[PDB]
Amino acid sequence: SGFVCNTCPEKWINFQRKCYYFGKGTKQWVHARYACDDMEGQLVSIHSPEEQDFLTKHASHTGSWIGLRNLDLKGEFIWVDGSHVDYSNWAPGEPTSRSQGEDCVMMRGSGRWNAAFCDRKLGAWVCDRLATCT
């Protein structure tokens, strides 16, 4: 068993179909997106409890930016990478307990998600990309 494509860049960690990068250093949501982009990845999208568990396990104990955003003024949250929102792991009350304009999402040390202002400075951020074929 396994995945035929399972190769990851150095400093990245493979999990199933994808590779993950756990970034450190204070960034607002958009700068975080840039850091992922510059490494040819994207802010992470999450599609299963198994992925979430792997992330909770490896991710910063403080908060991390992920690639989930509300862009349409109707509070519909979508992944930056065009994937759609099947799985969710929201904290209690979230996301509707958020304020108008809180268009971004962070992942807590526990793994659960909470909407947050995009201009928050967080000390961690998670990128992913598809594992390469060899």
Residue 78's domain spans which residues? 12-131
3-state secondary structure of 30: helix
DSSP assignments along 80-110, one per residue: TTS-------BPTTTTTTSPTT--EEEE-TT
Count structural domains, the chain. Answer: 1
- Hunting for tokens 């979508």 — which residue is that? 78
Instruction: Determine the 3-state secondary structure of 73 from DSSP.
Output: coil
Q: Report if residue 83 sits inside a domain.
A: yes
Residue 5 lies in a domain: no
Resolution to 1 decimal place, in Å: 2.2
Distance (Å, whole) CA 34 – CA 50: 27
Rounded CA separation 32/66 (Å) = 9
The CATH number for 64's domain is 3.10.100.10
User: What is the rounded distance in angstroms from the CA atom of residue 120 to the CA atom of residue 130?
Assistant: 28
Solved with: X-ray
For residue 118, being part of any structural domain is answered with yes
Task: Answer yes or no: are the C-beta atoms of 91 and 30 closer than 8 Å.
Answer: no
- Rounded to an integer, what is the distance from CA 96 to the centroid of its chain? 19
Nearest partner of 127 among 48, 5, 15, 50, judged by Cα? 15
Residue 17 in domain:
yes
Q: Is residue 4 part of a domain?
A: no
Look at residue 6 and tell me if it is in a domain: no
